[PDB]
Amino acid sequence: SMNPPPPETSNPNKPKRQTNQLQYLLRVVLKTLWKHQFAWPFQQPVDAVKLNLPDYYKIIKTPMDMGTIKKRLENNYYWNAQECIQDFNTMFTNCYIYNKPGDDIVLMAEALEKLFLQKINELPTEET
């Protein structure tokens, strides 16, 4: 089998912006998560071929990972902080769909998501 093409990290027709919130997401939120003990499985797309995962890309049609989100923040791909926050949420949700509650990968995701939500509370309250 084959993996699909990864999600785009640049698009020459999509308008770009840097906001205070998008900056905080790169400089504070992603940085914290990236260095965490349980980050590594989320630092790049799920290689479903190499991990031999049954029907992964048949169940997960909107894949997402921190590797992608990191390059997207670095390339000023997003217009809004909400676009980025929904990428984080997609990634967690995906994990909780494909994997059994309480399995190791889910406990890792749950720890990252708790840390995510703590740092999302510190966001500048207005996007400028």
Ligand SMILES: Cc1noc(C)c1-c1ccc2nc(-c3cnn(CC(C)(C)O)c3)nc(N3CCOC[C@@H]3c3ccccc3)c2c1
């Ligand atoms: C699936 C899935 N859904 O959301 C995410 C995120 C995943 C995901 C992503 C990457 C993964 N990478 C591995 C992995 C890559 N190398 N190794 C080390 C070694 C010695 C080859 O086993 C383990 N291993 C992974 N899983 C695959 C499924 O079962 C558990 C196994 C795992 C999880 C955590 C630690 C070790 C192994 C996993 C999983």
